[PDB]
């Protein structure tokens, strides 16, 4: 769901970044209100995500090679397919009788990603899928290339499509390097609604601005709002304006001709109660981008797992079910607490 | 003294405009808690019927299967949601879908080339066949009873012109959508209204009268038609406070910002309900009041538990 | 990817207004503001939905591997 910023430099066109839009123009209310909007946490409309807001997808590619052991055709023996029948015929639920999954297939970790037969084992064996989440098989690509003959098609590259829904903890940022995770997907009814009849897509807390001095974001809000109402792009090149031609006046007057608060606020009502909020809320249209770092995906838990044989201590890595390190500083710190029974 | 009948004495409605798709109506002399209840319910709680289980048989298109499923969910159907009850979960999917609880829409499109477009570009619609996949392509598949039942309410996409997908020759889509009953609260796809919002009647307290060119000069400070001047030698008056947008632009100027107050009428509510087409907005409102009452009946009906 | 079905913020169905709008900028040689005014996108939530759209699918579609080239 890609869009072209309303507010841009003219080099946005001159460098064509419009070919590859990396974000979208969102309705933002600059408001602390919900109590989950502090410091680095911002709220999205739940129904907005349900309408597809920031929906993104992640592709993972796999190379299944079998020529790594090569060494004089001779004993090469694995062919995708079956031989012993003794395999669970439920493997057909995902893999065609040639050993490759039906393009489009839903796969979950543990499901077979392909099926093959090695004469040495006289068995139909499979390479299992290892992931934290289910995917769908997007492409199956047959590689006989650079080979001398290899006609048995022993190398296949399979591309998986893993959907990435906007979710609590996923990082989001404006064009101002003011990044924050979505703390919660607020129900649309619970959002505040303007007398214009709308409730924002994203809410950013005002107290974030005073340290950051992200006032470019304020002008981006007032210009993107003006440019949507009058319906034209606005130039954001540094110093197109001047101390005697402020953008707040240019877009402010343009907005007032439009029919909206010169300061850009709009009287909104609390979704919950319904009273008019104390003041007119600063609302605008800001290009927001979803960072690839869904560190949300970085969650990990291990109550049991593998251990290194040289220590019999938890192995490493989220994908390895590894265990986080209690380092020296955490050891010392726990001694600080006196928690010696916790330290042991 | 206060009784609910003294409210009935005090409560008023004024309907400005009733389109079969838009309703602009006012509730005078009510509580905000009630208007917010209706609004909130109209948004999340009014049940609607929407695609829920899309069964693909083939999709070779350059559009992501999951995404297309979401888009098919998003299409609002012109369906009286009362033709179906809710589908439970206590039971297997084979029991989930019956002609009593589910409506099926089939989509079978095969893209071709067209027999030879002149020129150059030639319009993908000219160069290709069925390049544009629209909601109008949802063939309705009744079963038995409702087959008869829709004789005079057949299933139609509420907007056939919605572009659903764009294909290329050799791409094909065969899928069977299962449209079910859902609430605007469980997903925005079940919201029967696009926008249900209310605004309190702005109150324009003229502190001292203004006249002449300051009266018309003040009049142009507000939405065109809110402030009326009859003579202006004596006052600049308010033709209609309902026309105002509360831009508070007048406050930029002391010529006026010291002789006027901008408030609201806490009792008077200007509702704006726009329908997604499934139902006329007033009909949706009727469901909102009967729904809230039904909930109070449920709470009377409930046994005090412990 | 493709013109969104509904305006994320508002909820108004918007997918019907794409081709006519593009036609109206072509056929009616209109301006974006007036075109959207005739299309009824009288909210900036609905204004922005179409105004900002980038129907990149036309660029995707030229990569269709299911036809010879």
């Amino acid at each position: 769901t890609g869009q072209t910023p309303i507010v841009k430099a003219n080099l946005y066109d001159d460098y064509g970044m419009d070919n590859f839009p990396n974000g979208f123009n969102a309705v933002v209310a600059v408001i602390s209100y919900t109590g989950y909007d502090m410091d680095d946490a911002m709220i999205i409309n739940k129904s907005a995500d349900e309408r597809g807001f920031g929906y993104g997808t992640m592709y993972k590619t796999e190379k299944v090679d079998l020529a790594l052991n090569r060494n004089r055709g001779d004993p090469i023996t694995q062919h995708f397919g079956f031989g012993n029948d003794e395999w669970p015929k439920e493997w057909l639920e995902k893999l065609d009788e040639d050993g490759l999954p039906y393009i489009g297939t839903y796969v979950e970790e543990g499901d077979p990603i392909c099926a093959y037969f090695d004469d040495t084992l006289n068995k139909t064996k499979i390479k299992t899928y290892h992931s934290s989440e289910p995917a769908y098989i997007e492409e199956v690509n047959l590689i006989g290339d650079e080979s001398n003959k290899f006609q048995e098609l022993q190398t296949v590259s399979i591309k998986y499509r893993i959907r990435r829904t906007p979710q609590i903890g996923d990082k989001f940022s404006s064009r101002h390097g003011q990044k924050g995770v979505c703390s919660r997907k607020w129900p649309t009814i619970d959002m505040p609604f303007s007398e214009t009849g709308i409730q924002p897509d994203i809410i950013i807390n005002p107290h974030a601005f005073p340290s950051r001095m992200t006032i470019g974001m304020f002008v981006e809000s007032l210009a993107g709002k003006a440019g949507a109402l009058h319906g034209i792009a606005q130039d954001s090149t540094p110093w197109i304006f001047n101390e005697d031609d402020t953008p707040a006046d240019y877009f402010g007057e343009q907005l007032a001709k439009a029919g909206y608060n010169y300061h850009g606020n709009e009287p909104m009502y609390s979704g919950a109660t319904g009273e008019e909020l104390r003041a007119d809320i600063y609302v605008g249209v800001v290009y927001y981008q979803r960072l690839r770092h869904m560190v949300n995906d970085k969650f990990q838990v291990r109550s049991t797992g593998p251990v290194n044989s040289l220590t019999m201590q938890p192995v490493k890595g989220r994908k390895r079910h590894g265990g986080i390190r209690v380092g020296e500083m955490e050891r010392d710190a726990l001694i600080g607490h006196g928690t010696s029974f916790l330290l042991q | 003294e206060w009784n609910v009948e003294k409210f009935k004495k005090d409560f008023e409605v004024n309907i400005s405009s009733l389109d079969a798709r838009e309703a602009n109506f006012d509730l005078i002399n009510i509580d905000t808690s009630i208007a917010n209840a209706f609004r909130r319910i109209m948004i999340s709680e009014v049940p609607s019927v929407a695609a829920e289980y899309v069964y693909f048989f083939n999709n070779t298109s350059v559009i992501q299967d999951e995404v297309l499923a979401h888009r098919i969910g998003l299409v609002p159907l012109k369906v009286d949601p009362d033709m179906l009850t809710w589908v439970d979960s206590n039971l297997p999917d084979d029991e989930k879908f019956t002609d009593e609880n589910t409506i099926v829409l089939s989509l079978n499109v095969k893209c071709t080339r067209n027999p030879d477009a002149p020129k150059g570009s030639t319009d993908p619609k000219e160069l290709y066949n069925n390049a544009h996949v629209y909601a109008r392509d949802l063939k309705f598949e009744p079963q038995g009873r409702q087959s008869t039942t829709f004789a005079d309410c057949p299933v139609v996409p509420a907007d056939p012109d919605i572009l659903l997908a764009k294909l290329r020759p050799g791409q094909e889509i065969s899928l069977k959508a299962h449209c079910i009953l859902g609430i605007g609260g469980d997903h925005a796809k079940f919201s029967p209204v696009s926008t249900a919002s209310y605004r309190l009647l702005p109150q324009i307290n003229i502190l001292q009268p203004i006249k002449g060119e300051s009266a018309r000069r003040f009049q142009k400070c507000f939405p065109p038609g809110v402030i009326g001047i009859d003579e202006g030698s004596d006052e600049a008056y308010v033709k209609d406070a309902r026309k105002d947008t509360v831009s508070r632009e007048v406050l930029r100027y002391e010529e006026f910002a010291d002789k006027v107050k901008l408030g609201r009428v806490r009792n008077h509510f200007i509702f704006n309900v726009e329908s997604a087409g499934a139902m006329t907005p007033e009909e949706i409102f009727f469901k909102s009041v009967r729904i809230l009452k039904n909930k109070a009946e449920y709470l009377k009906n409930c046994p005090i538990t412990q | 990817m493709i013109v969104p079905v509904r305006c994320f913020s508002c909820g108004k169905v918007v997918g019907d207004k794409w081709e006519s709008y593009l036609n109206l900028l072509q056929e009616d040689e209109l301006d974006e503001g007036t075109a959207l005014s005739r299309l009824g996108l009288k909210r900036y939530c609905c204004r922005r939905m179409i105004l900002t759209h980038v129907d990149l699918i036309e660029k995707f579609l030229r990569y269709n591997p299911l036809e010879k080239r």
Binding site: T196, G197, L229, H230, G231, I232, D235, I240, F241, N242, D245, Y250, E253, Q254, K257, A258, G259, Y260 | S16, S17, N24, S197, R199, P223, P224, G225, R242, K243, D244, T245, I270, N272 | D31, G33, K42, Y44
Partner: peptide, 24 residues
């Protein structure tokens, strides 16, 4: 320096609910 020009189609883009440009 020249000031960035203001737009010519500088006209009302908002109405009350219930109203239109038939009053504009």
């Amino acid at each position: 320096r020249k000031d960035v020009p203001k737009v010519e189609g500088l006209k009302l883009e908002h109405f009350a609910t219930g109203y239109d440009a038939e009053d504009f």
